[PDB]
Amino acid sequence: KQFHTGIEIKVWAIACFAPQRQCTEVHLKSFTEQLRKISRDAGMPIQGQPCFCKYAQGADSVEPMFRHLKNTYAGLQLVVVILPGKTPVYAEVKRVGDTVLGMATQCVQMKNVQRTTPQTLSNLCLKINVKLG
């Protein structure tokens, strides 16, 4: 689909369901910086500082966390959800985001956070662009 202009992601959160010992704070920070730069260059700037960035474990933690985000951050535009491979967390993120709370979410695999590439970062920007466009 076509690229949409005019998108600026100022308020956004990270929810990392990958274990911290596998996807550490510096992985999160570095991934975020690479995403900031490419999204900026593409004309859909995602600001470098998320309003919230926490680890969580298990599908049951999704709904309480998303409720908390909705209840805490006005103008929240996006939750980026880091997944540890194939798990029920993905289905739940979509149930709560799309159906229960009407919250935009974008999932990304832990392996693509630990080690980014321009191509995987691009895939991510385009998915985000469709969602918010």
CA atoms within 13 A on the CB side of 73: 20
Domain span holding position 109: 8-133
Instruction: Tell me which residue has tokens 């880091």.
Output: 82
Q: Residue 18 is encoded by which pair of tokens? A: 């990958």
Q: Is residue 2 part of a domain?
A: no
DSSP letter assigned to residue 23: S
Total domains present in the chain: 1
H, E, C per residue of 64-125: HHHHHHHHHCCCCCEEEEEECCCCCHHHHHHHHHHHHHCCCEEEEEHHHHHCCCHHHHHHHH
Report residue 9 as tokens.
């992601």
| Cα(33)–Cα(28) distance, integer angstroms | 9
3 lies in a domain?
A: no
> Residue 128: CA atoms inside 13 Å, Cβ hemisphere, count?
28
Token pair belonging to 104: 């935009």
Q: What is the CATH number of the domain that holds 106?
A: 3.40.50.2300
Q: Are 18 and 113 in contact (CB under 8 A)?
A: yes
Elucidation method: X-ray
Cβ neighbours of 57 (radius 10 Å): 13
Asked whether residue 1 is domain-assigned, the answer is no
| Kind plus residue range of the DSSP H or E element containing 55 | strand 52-55
Strands 105-109 and 52-55: unpaired
For residue 90, is it within any domain? Answer: yes
Burial of 119 (0-12, 13-18, 19+ CB in 10 A): exposed
